[PDB]
Design a protein around this motif. Structure first.
Motif, PDB file in Angstrom:
ATOM      1  N   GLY A 206      10.490 103.076  31.086  1.00 39.45           N
ATOM      2  CA  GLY A 206      10.461 103.478  32.902  1.00 39.45           C
ATOM      3  C   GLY A 206      10.803 104.823  32.886  1.00 39.45           C
ATOM      4  N   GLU A 207       9.860 105.336  32.776  1.00 38.27           N
ATOM      5  CA  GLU A 207       9.861 107.056  32.829  1.00 38.27           C
ATOM      6  C   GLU A 207       8.533 108.062  32.844  1.00 38.27           C
ATOM      7  OE1 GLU A 207       9.629 109.637  29.197  1.00 38.27           O
ATOM      8  OE2 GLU A 207      12.053 109.812  29.404  1.00 38.27           O
ATOM      9  N   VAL A 208       9.238 108.875  34.154  1.00 41.64           N
ATOM     10  CA  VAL A 208       8.485 110.286  34.667  1.00 41.64           C
ATOM     11  C   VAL A 208       8.900 111.603  33.777  1.00 41.64           C
ATOM     12  CG1 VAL A 208       7.263 111.372  36.553  1.00 41.64           C
ATOM     13  CG2 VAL A 208       8.053 109.012  36.852  1.00 41.64           C
ATOM     14  N   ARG A 209       7.520 112.207  33.708  1.00 41.80           N
ATOM     15  CA  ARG A 209       8.100 113.161  32.496  1.00 41.80           C
ATOM     16  C   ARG A 209       7.203 114.179  33.005  1.00 41.80           C
ATOM     17  NH1 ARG A 209       7.025 109.574  28.448  1.00 41.80           N
ATOM     18  NH2 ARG A 209       5.157 110.184  27.204  1.00 41.80           N
ATOM     19  N   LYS A 210       6.745 115.067  32.391  1.00 43.07           N
ATOM     20  CA  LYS A 210       5.830 116.797  32.690  1.00 43.07           C
ATOM     21  C   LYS A 210       4.923 116.675  31.723  1.00 43.07           C
ATOM     22  CE  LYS A 210       6.042 121.280  34.834  1.00 43.07           C
ATOM     23  NZ  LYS A 210       5.267 121.618  34.678  1.00 43.07           N
TER      24      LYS A 210
END
Ligand code: ATP
Ligand code: MG
Ligand code: MG
Lengths: 441, 437
Positions: A206-210
């Motif tokens: 469920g995640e957006v990251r770099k």
RNA sequence: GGAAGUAGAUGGUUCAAGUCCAUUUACUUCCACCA
RNA sequence: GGAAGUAGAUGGUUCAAGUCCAUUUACUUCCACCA
């Protein structure tokens, strides 16, 4: 005029009509019958199984679930056997993973063998995740079918739909994942305006990251980038498109454009106004699948572009086209003709032994001293980019892709001017040059 | 026909015959009478006073010694006044330090004012170390004056004699310090084969060492580099020349290389064979001294060469020529014609606001994405190096030297082909292009 | 088939090649063709 | 007149250029014109 009414009308472009749905259902029924009769283990997967396919693009995926113990050759033999047995007519054409493409009751079908794994870790064949994709999506995509179809239609109309080498865009499965992650076409588009070349989308978490690059984590295999073959530039184009659509929403974004027929005279005038050298390397198309040919066309055109840059012809952009019988590698350069003479750097004046060696070669012109170094005038063996490429492609055919380079070894020609404008490459010349108003609809 | 034989046939070209030696003595006779009449403290210096000038190159140096109290202005007015009174004919033309050039009984003379100080350190006027230069060389140059002549004649024949901006070579004074250092022309030539751009020659200590640059230290002023104005390239040319002479000595090294006339048509043929764009910027020559003019021509040339570089015309070399009426800035470029369209780099695709502004510009063709960034096709205002330079010189005249720039502002032309080949620039074009024969 | 990586070998160009243009061996991975 | 440096003040070009193109103030040397 507002997005909601745009999206209502766009649905008419992307939702299959009942007749096509019916045709699909009947082919599915016949396929199940033929497969049940064989006593074979199979599963319907892909966009047909999930009702997320585009109007006008019905294609059924059937997967055959083989023992993990089977050799790759056994997988090929049996898969192809079953495929041919269950299709009305068929074609077998593939790059690595074997499968049968064909038709049942007018409907296209891929019959694909895979290994029946317990988990899609340490996959044995290239396609083994696909049954797990279906199980993951089946109870998560319900009631979002038309959101998926909007995203697919939007991508397709803008030429960035499909992960195959010819497109280097967004797969269907990637579209489904995005829709699960964001909830809707509109939300996907709104959020993609903020995507970067470092954006990581992890739908299972469920995640957006770099991260280090653009990575959409497969919920079925954390090591798999679903967007592995989306090019940086196609990512760029989608981000920019989402920004444009939000700024000024229009049904036009779901309507594909086609190249206009351009008279060789509009072309002549344009190239004349630009003042450039425009030319193509033409050769016979290797009889190989798209997924082998396209990266080879990409390779050949880069190696030649790179030759043109180091030879100081100032290439602008390149393009290519594969026609039925021929391929074309297209180039535009700022320098139509360079001088014969150039400078070669010699040693510093102090280094007497090396100066001797530098001065020993006979030349038409005298070497000279400039800023404490010896320099010499030398002569090029070519003065136009076309002459350069004739030389380069004749001697460096081998570095231009396995099958492309071998074809170029057998025959190639360099074409320019009206001779070129008469070749089926006008769409590619127009795009390469950024010609305004050469596409429509 | 070996080395020492070549050196002896060379003397007939550098040593002044007794009739011109006599010509000088009775002009020096007439100088000492005229100066020994107004009183005037004065001292004969330079090469005439050391007996080290070249055959047919006779010029006398007279220095007026003024008390340190004299202002900058009174050194000038009083010094110029004495020079005018004492010379048959006279011209007054200088860059900074005032003096009088003239003629006495057919002999060229410089009358130079200076301050009679103790110690040539913390110098007041630009010429103050000159009388001390002479007091150092007085006896040390005796029995070595012909070795000086040999070295000066060698440099003069190869276009590298003189510290002035027109030349940027070796000063006569430097030539004498080298002969004092090494003992003979031959030893200088032999040793110079091993000079680097880092060589330091300290005559006062009697040593060759390795320093930061080529620095021949003045024995009367260790702060001062006598070779200050020797261009690296002319040092490079001398060092190579020395290696060439020692490898195979010839009397040809002492004769000035022929003018070698090339007609417009052969030059035209060569340019055509090279396939280059060859052109000049021609303008009226500023009525200024050489030592002001030449550094400005260098600057103008460089500024335009750098324009041609960044405009992708691929310049090869430049040169310049000053005539009586006109100056010429000469250029050769690998590109005769460039396309009108070019590429201009825009922002990374992520930068929404800058992309928007980049894309808002009105252009003839559609911008495109390449490797994560936007690019535009843009259209040039000029497609040839001649028209590019026309635009540059009109717009940037002010950056091309004070007087050279001012002249270009009022008028210049760009010239190429038969028209350029008619101009008196053929020597410079041949040199520039490395033309043989 | 293309790409990335590791450990090497070689030819050509040049006054001068870890550095430029190519050729080549081994072991790794990845992508496309199904999704 | 040209060059090198120390402290700055602007303008133009550009999506943005403390980095591109130029303009300018003060201080500080140096070089050529004589040697
Ligand atoms: N034998 C050679 N022939 C031609 N070019 C060379 C050669 N050797 C070095 N070079 C040049 O130098 C590059 C290699 O990098 P390297 O670490 O040697 O710096 P470098 O060449 O010594 O640079 P510089 O001389 O300016 O210090 C090459 O790209 C090439 O341009
Ligand atoms: Mg399908
Ligand atoms: Mg004199």
């Amino acid at each position: 005029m507002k997005v909601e009414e745009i999206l209502e009308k766009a649905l008419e472009l992307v939702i299959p009509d009942e007749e096509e749905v019916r045709k699909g259902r009947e082919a599915e029924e016949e396929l199940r019958r033929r497969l049940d009769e064989l006593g074979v283990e199979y599963v319907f997967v892909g966009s047909y199984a999930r009702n997320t396919w585009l109007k006008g693009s019905l294609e059924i995926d059937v997967f055959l679930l083989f023992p993990e113990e089977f050799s790759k050759e056994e997988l090929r033999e049996r898969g192809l056997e079953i495929g041919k047995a269950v299709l009305d007519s068929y074609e077998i054409r593939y790059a690595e993973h074997p499968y049968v493409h064909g038709v049942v009751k007018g409907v296209e079908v891929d019959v694909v063998p895979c290994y029946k794994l317990k988990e899609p870790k340490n996959i044995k064949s290239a396609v083994d995740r696909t049954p797990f994709h279906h199980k993951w999506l089946e109870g998560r995509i319900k009631g979002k079918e038309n959101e998926v179809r909007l995203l697919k239609g939007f991508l397709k109309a803008n030429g960035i739909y499909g992960a195959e080498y010819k497109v280097r865009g967004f797969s269907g499965y990637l579209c489904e994942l995005l829709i699960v992650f964001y909830g809707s076409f509109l939300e996907t588009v709104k959020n993609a305006r903020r995507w970067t070349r470092r954006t990581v989308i992890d739908v299972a978490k469920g995640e957006v990251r770099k991260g280090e690059e653009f990575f959409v984590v497969d919920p079925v295999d954390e090591k798999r980038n679903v967007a592995a073959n989306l090019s940086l530039d196609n990512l760029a184009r989608f981000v920019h498109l989402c920004r444009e659509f939000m700024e000024a929403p229009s049904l036009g974004f779901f309507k594909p454009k086609h190249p206009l027929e351009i008279e060789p005279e509009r072309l002549r005038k344009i190239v004349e106004e630009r003042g450039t050298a425009v030319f193509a390397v033409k050769f016979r198309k290797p009889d190989i699948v798209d997924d082998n040919l396209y990266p080879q066309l990409e390779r050949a055109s880069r190696k030649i572009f790179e030759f043109l840059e180091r030879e100081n012809f100032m290439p602008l952009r390149s393009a290519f086209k594969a026609s039925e019988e021929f391929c074309y590698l297209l180039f535009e350069c700022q320098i139509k003709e360079i001088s014969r003479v150039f400078r070669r750097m010699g040693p510093q004046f102090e280094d007497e032994r090396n100066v001797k060696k530098f001065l020993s070669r006979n030349r038409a012109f005298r070497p000279f001293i400039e800023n404490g170094r010896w320099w010499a005038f030398e002569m090029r063996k070519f003065t136009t980019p076309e002459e350069g490429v004739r030389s380069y492609a004749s001697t460096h055919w081998h570095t231009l892709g396995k099958n492309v380079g071998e074809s170029i070894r057998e025959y190639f020609e360099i074409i320019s001017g009206e001779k070129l404008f008469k070749e089926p490459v006008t769409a590619e010349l127009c795009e390469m040059m950024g010609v305004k108003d050469c596409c429509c609809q």
